[PDB]
Design an enzyme around this catalytic site. Structure first.
Site, short mmCIF file in Angstrom:
data_model
loop_
_atom_site.label_atom_id
_atom_site.label_comp_id
_atom_site.label_asym_id
_atom_site.label_seq_id
_atom_site.Cartn_x
_atom_site.Cartn_y
_atom_site.Cartn_z
N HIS A 48 0.80 -1.23 0.00
CA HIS A 48 0.00 0.00 0.00
C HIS A 48 0.83 1.28 0.00
CE1 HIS A 48 -0.10 -0.20 4.56
NE2 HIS A 48 0.08 1.12 4.42
N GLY A 65 2.78 6.32 9.43
CA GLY A 65 4.16 6.15 9.02
C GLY A 65 4.82 4.89 9.57
N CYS A 74 4.00 1.78 9.16
CA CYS A 74 3.95 0.57 8.32
C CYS A 74 5.29 0.20 7.77
CB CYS A 74 2.89 0.67 7.22
SG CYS A 74 1.19 0.79 7.85
C1 LIG Z 1 0.62 2.49 7.94
N1 LIG Z 1 1.58 3.36 8.11
C2 LIG Z 1 -0.67 2.64 8.70
C3 LIG Z 1 -0.59 2.18 10.14
C4 LIG Z 1 -1.80 2.66 10.92
C5 LIG Z 1 -1.78 4.18 11.11
C6 LIG Z 1 -2.55 4.36 12.41
N2 LIG Z 1 -2.12 3.22 13.18
C7 LIG Z 1 -1.77 2.16 12.35
O1 LIG Z 1 -1.51 1.02 12.70
N3 LIG Z 1 -1.65 1.85 7.99
C8 LIG Z 1 -2.84 2.40 7.61
O2 LIG Z 1 -3.15 3.57 7.77
C9 LIG Z 1 -3.76 1.40 6.97
C10 LIG Z 1 -3.71 1.43 5.47
C11 LIG Z 1 -5.04 1.87 4.96
C12 LIG Z 1 -5.94 2.14 6.10
N4 LIG Z 1 -5.13 1.81 7.30
C13 LIG Z 1 -5.61 1.55 8.55
O3 LIG Z 1 -4.91 1.03 9.42
C14 LIG Z 1 -7.04 1.95 8.81
N5 LIG Z 1 -7.66 0.72 9.30
C15 LIG Z 1 -8.80 0.19 8.71
O4 LIG Z 1 -9.48 0.74 7.85
C16 LIG Z 1 -9.16 -1.16 9.28
F1 LIG Z 1 -10.02 -1.08 10.33
F2 LIG Z 1 -9.74 -1.98 8.37
F3 LIG Z 1 -8.07 -1.85 9.69
C17 LIG Z 1 -7.13 3.11 9.80
C18 LIG Z 1 -8.56 3.59 9.78
C19 LIG Z 1 -6.26 4.25 9.32
C20 LIG Z 1 -6.78 2.72 11.22
C21 LIG Z 1 -4.52 0.49 4.58
C22 LIG Z 1 -4.08 0.31 3.17
C23 LIG Z 1 -5.18 -0.68 5.20
#
Ligand SMILES: *C(=N)[C@H](C[C@@H]1CCNC1=O)NC(=O)[C@@H]1[C@@H]2[C@H](CN1C(=O)[C@@H](NC(=O)C(F)(F)F)C(C)(C)C)C2(C)C
Ligand SMILES: *C(=N)[C@H](C[C@@H]1CCNC1=O)NC(=O)[C@@H]1[C@@H]2[C@H](CN1C(=O)[C@@H](NC(=O)C(F)(F)F)C(C)(C)C)C2(C)C
EC number: 3.4.19.12
Lengths: 306, 306
Positions: free
Chosen positions: A41, A143, A145
């Site tokens: 992603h 950030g 990830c």
């Molecule tokens: C990567 N850097 C982030 C890590 C997130 C940021 C907040 N805390 C974390 O663990 N990953 C994301 O933002 C991923 C990314 C899109 C959306 N996202 C989510 O983690 C979202 N979660 C969801 O929609 C759910 F519930 F299905 F897991 C969010 C709402 C931002 C928490 C992708 C591609 C999954």
């Protein structure tokens, strides 16, 4: 004496962290040999994350659209491939700091160290267990990830986790280093459920053995039980069913303390049924399930690494 | 989201650990520049530890009685001196892995990372707070002495602790990197008392702010209080008295959440007086006091290091 939640030393993993940018999106990458691994992603915009078609999105990307940076040094990308939910970017330079490593898929109940990273730079290190529902209880912000989970076996770093997302209940989800998610999760910003989280029974028993080793043993009653009678009570409290394999793994702790696993199960039964009464065990007012029997043995011996 | 107890990445400190042997006694040393630092009780036998006269004991030692080993490599000792409870051994070779560093004396309430070591090799890393009674709650076994505590300020490792001994209540004691013990402790195997351990109030308030930031806020009542009325209640529970300096440090957290420190004090008062009723805060059934306001801000921003 003393029992603490302890992460593996992170130095060997620090040398493998890089920053991966595609468009405006920046995340962490793991640079081992001439390959950099990161969540796929990284190619998404905020809008794309809602319902991505990774194949079509990736088809609009060339090697030059990936900015891989190690400190203040750019790595030249000469290949790219999608392996499940991870993007592998081939670079022209092997990491001179590549340690002896392997990729493993950990099982639920098993623990690992997480080196939380932002912009390719390590921020901190903490220990996690892969829950029975395939989620972790981390501390991840925007950030984070690409931050990885690992174990150390003397000289060999075993990579088992890569952070991808956070679920509605505050818990976390990610993949192994081949890009397969632990659990039913998908890398899409859509409502997803973790499912009932159960308690890692063998780990709770291992933690009760560490408490006994460290002089804390008020909870030890004069009762005993059977595997089926203990399981009948544990399932009522959402505890994972204890098996003969679990009994055998607790062996070294049972031998070092002189306490049969089934006797320790009966004391756990009375703790589940009657509570802790405001008392603590190893400074905790809850039953701790994120220490495996191996985590307890390693700490009650002082196993060291290269 | 998520809030975890997190240690600093330990790589910069891993490169400074060496094994120091004198006679049969082996412990850890910290090799920075052309100097190795270790606890002075490395010169003691088991019998000597009962009532040592370090000056007379050290007077029977020459440079060649100290075996300093970095991996499978011996360092040649060309000088030795006792600075308070630490022995400094001058070696012919500067550590090529010496990071930018400084020696600091931390204050009570402040936190630091401990890289637990055995035979000069890192075993694990965990976070500790210097208690108000100058003890730490570690996990140290035989051979762990010389294991150090540190903080990281972007590129600079600040060394603040060196492990020397364990007290009767299971807690730990040691010195700064100049050899001065934190607390009234002496490096002698004789009965020693830690004294009443009080709760780091500013840290408990910082942890309540992290809970609020992470959506956990059931404990927030509609009451408020004064610094003297809150202190009058906190001293009954062995809580350290909150001061205007503490209020100012909580500033950034108070601003980020929209909650006045005195309002948060009233909710803490009702938590102390009426308990938690089996409920949890950040997955804990006790009030946590080992996170400073700086630890909370660093984690609710993702501050990274070199
Ligand atoms: C990567 N850097 C982030 C890590 C997130 C940021 C907040 N805390 C974390 O663990 N990953 C994301 O933002 C991923 C990314 C899109 C959306 N996202 C989510 O983690 C979202 N979660 C969801 O929609 C759910 F519930 F299905 F897991 C969010 C709402 C931002 C928490 C992708 C591609 C999954
Ligand atoms: C150094 N490697 C050890 C670290 C100890 C080992 C067990 N857990 C630890 O933290 N240091 C010692 O063994 C020091 C050492 C002599 C005695 N000792 C102690 O820690 C003893 N403590 C005391 O006598 C007391 F209570 F005063 F602190 C021990 C009984 C072994 C716990 C010297 C020179 C202080």
């Amino acid at each position: 004496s003393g029992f603490r939640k302890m992460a593996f030393p992170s130095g060997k993993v620090e040398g493998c962290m890089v920053q991966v940018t595609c468009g405006t999106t920046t995340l962490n990458g793991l640079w081992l040999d001439d390959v950099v691994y990161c969540p796929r992603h990284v190619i998404c915009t905020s809008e794309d994350m809602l319902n991505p078609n990774y194949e079509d999105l990736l088809i609009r990307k060339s090697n030059h659209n990936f900015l891989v940076q190690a400190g203040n040094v750019q790595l030249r990308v000469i290949g790219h491939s999608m392996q499940n939910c991870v993007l592998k970017l081939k670079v022209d330079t092997a990491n001179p700091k590549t340690p002896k490593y392997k990729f493993v898929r950990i099982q639920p109940g098993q623990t690992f160290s997480v080196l939380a990273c932002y912009n390719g730079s390590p921020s901190g290190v903490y220990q996690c267990a892969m829950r029975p529902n395939f989620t972790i209880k981390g501390s991840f912000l925007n950030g984070s990830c690409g931050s990885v989970g690992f174990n150390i076996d003397y000289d060999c770093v075993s990579f088992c986790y890569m952070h991808h997302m956070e679920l509605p209940t505050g818990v976390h989800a990610g993949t192994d280093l081949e890009g397969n998610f632990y659990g039913p999760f998908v890398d899409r910003q859509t409502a997803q459920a973790a499912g009932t989280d159960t308690t890692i029974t063998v780990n709770v028993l291992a933690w009760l053995y560490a408490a006994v080793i460290n002089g804390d043993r008020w909870f030890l009653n004069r009762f005993t039980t059977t595997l089926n009678d203990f399981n009948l009570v544990a399932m009522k409290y959402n505890y994972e069913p204890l098996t003969q394999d679990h009994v055998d793994i607790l062996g070294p702790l049972s031998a070092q303390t002189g306490i049969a696993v089934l006797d320790m199960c009966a004391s756990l039964k009375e703790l589940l049924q009657n509570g802790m009464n405001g008392r603590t065990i190893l400074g905790s007012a809850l039953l701790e399930d994120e220490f495996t029997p191996f985590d307890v043995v390693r700490q009650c011996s002082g196993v060291t690494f290269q």
